Amino acid sequence: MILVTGSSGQIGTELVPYLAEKYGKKNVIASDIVQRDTGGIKFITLDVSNRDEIDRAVEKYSIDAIFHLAGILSAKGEKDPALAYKVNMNGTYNILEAAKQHRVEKVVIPSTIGVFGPETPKNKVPSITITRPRTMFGVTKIAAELLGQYYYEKFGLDVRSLRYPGIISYKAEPTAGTTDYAVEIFYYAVKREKYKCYLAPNRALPMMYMPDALKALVDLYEADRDKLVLRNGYNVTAYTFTPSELYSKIKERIPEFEIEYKEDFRDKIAATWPESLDSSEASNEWGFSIEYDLDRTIDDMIDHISEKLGIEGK
Amino acid sequence: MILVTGSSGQIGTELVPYLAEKYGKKNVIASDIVQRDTGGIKFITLDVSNRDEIDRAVEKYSIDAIFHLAGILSAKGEKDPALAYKVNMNGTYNILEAAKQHRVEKVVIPSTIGVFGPETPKNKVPSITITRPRTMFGVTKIAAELLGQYYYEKFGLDVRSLRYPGIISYKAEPTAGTTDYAVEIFYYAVKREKYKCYLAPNRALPMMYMPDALKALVDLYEADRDKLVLRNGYNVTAYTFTPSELYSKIKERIPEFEIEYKEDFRDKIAATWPESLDSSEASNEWGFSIEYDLDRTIDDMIDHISEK
Ligand SMILES: NC(=O)c1ccc[n+]([C@@H]2O[C@H](COP(=O)([O-])OP(=O)(O)OC[C@H]3O[C@@H](n4cnc5c(N)ncnc54)[C@H](O)[C@@H]3O)[C@@H](O)[C@H]2O)c1
Ligand SMILES: NC(=O)c1ccc[n+]([C@@H]2O[C@H](COP(=O)([O-])OP(=O)(O)OC[C@H]3O[C@@H](n4cnc5c(N)ncnc54)[C@H](O)[C@@H]3O)[C@@H](O)[C@H]2O)c1
Ligand SMILES: CC[C@@H](O)[C@H](N)C(=O)O
Ligand SMILES: CC[C@@H](O)[C@H](N)C(=O)O
């Protein structure tokens, strides 16, 4: 039995059916504080900041594994750091302690490049490096990585984590993040509307397409224990680009659209993160691999976004 | 009005009177969950894990600055991780949030070399380095440094912190801490009793004498805000030595002294930490300096432990 926390988010929206197709709908339980269609998969309300609720869910459903996705992202976290701290910090502690107290075999946590700060090298950053985040989001995530590793070393609980770069997807619409522009831009492109980008034209960031992000998280979950040395904090990425480069590439497909740059607080956040990551450790220790390069995800996004907005009929 | 949390600990035992002498008796308030003598200085019971208690105390005493010393250390943290998290993580968050809302103006937090882990370079480690702690204590402390810096950058709360190595002192009794062997050893030496050391004979660690530890904390506190760059995570140290080296030096003074090594979980904790630190940033930004070298602290300890 697999429990997914924060299932209604950008990742959960796709991870839940992904897990169900691979392990069976009856073996997956979706949960969040906000319910959304789960395609026939069992959904339970669960606030991770409430340890009592986690205990009850884990007990009632004999949970064997937890994909802990519940949390407040970088942007939303800066608007309300107190909320980010409660949900991210204490929510993760609750999940770890609950898993340990009950007999949950594995806990998988999606970390982020948000654990990095200004002092972290900007190019091809390895997994073991400087981690001095400057956002509440980043502080809570590096703490989660450290607590996860501690729960394994101290109690033997199988906790694993990877650090995702910005994730591009079309099934769910991201809202509380900093890398969301990489998704938003496609909607404006397909509608031939001028896009107002909130990041600097040259703000380079590591990114990856949802299909690969899902495969990576499940590959880590299924990885052989004998090769998991780093265990927590694996850098993963597919490619790096700036808003001006992505715009330029989308234009090669849809020339009748434009962009203007009006930076806000999110560009200040992105400025503290590295431009590209070195994912060699993830590939060496558990076979991490990418199937969608930039060209492929661009054409795939235009494809699905067009059908979603009725540009290309059903 | 300065509030000191965890005032009954090794540092607080000496910091309270130290602050009183420098800023006046009426301007210092001692607090802890365990009350001990403060020589007339006002004392109040305060559990930092309880946000309400902090809010009330800060309001009632018009606290302007806080020296947050409350916390569970490395050894006790491994025996009871949940307690370390509750006290260290929840407690520090509560202190910062309470200080942010209520009109608190300065917060000093003693960090530790415990924020380092196996991947951290072992020699002359700079302040900006790998910080992947492997103890609950270390995890809560690196989080403390990060939250502190965050509150400063986000809300303008003047939070400052330095990373102490092991601290040697004689006024407060040791509490079986990972680095406390460096204090216990003196008690056995003065009594000419064989000492049973729980750290390996060659377990090298950075250390410093309390007089310098106190001066460093206050120097950091007094530094002009807009002149601190690093602000949180300042590596500070006086010297590096192993148990066998300290033993050998003590023996030069008390030749009858003997020692045996029975390493336990505390040696495993120590093994994940660096041997020596680079403290140039602290010196350059706020004038950190050392007045007691190894020989001087050894003789000063024997002197004080003896007359005692
Ligand atoms: N999307 C990305 O590009 C990306 C990158 C790196 C890391 N991550 C991590 O992945 C996880 C989810 O990402 P996402 O993009 O799907 O986020 P999202 O913002 O789309 O969804 C977050 C979910 O958290 C839920 N939530 C908030 N508080 C909760 C609580 N107390 N209990 C249960 N649920 C709660 C929300 O209701 C929401 O459904 C987070 O931990 C995030 O930090 C995401
Ligand atoms: N002593 C050192 O060598 C050293 C080195 C590096 C960092 N530090 C840091 O300095 C601080 C104190 O060090 P110390 O040596 O004086 O510690 P100590 O062990 O001597 O004292 C700790 C104090 O914390 C108190 N305490 C526990 N829970 C509390 C709570 N909920 N509310 C209020 N007080 C509580 C204890 O009763 C005790 O008096 C800690 O934050 C520690 O991490 C100390
Ligand atoms: C690396 C980016 C992620 O943390 C998330 N998409 C965010 O924007 O906060
Ligand atoms: C660096 C050592 C300090 O953290 C404290 N004296 C301890 O023994 O944990």
UniProtKB/TrEMBL annotation, chain B:
Annotated pyruvate binding sites: 74, 112, 137, 178-179
Source species, domain of life: Archaea
Annotated protein name in UniProt: NDP-sugar epimerase
Residues engaged in binding NAD(+): 10-11, 32, 47-48, 69, 71, 141, 167
GO BP terms: L-threonine catabolic process
Keyword Nucleotide-binding: yes
Gene Ontology MF annotations: L-threonine 3-dehydrogenase activity; nucleotide binding
InterPro entries attached to this UniProt entry: Epimerase_deHydtase, NAD(P)-bd_dom_sf, NAD(P)_epim/dehydratase
Family: Belongs to the NAD(P)-dependent epimerase/dehydratase family.
Pfam families per the UniProt record, alphabetical: Epimerase
Sorted UniProt keywords: Nucleotide-binding
NAD-dependent epimerase/dehydratase domain: residues covered: 2-188
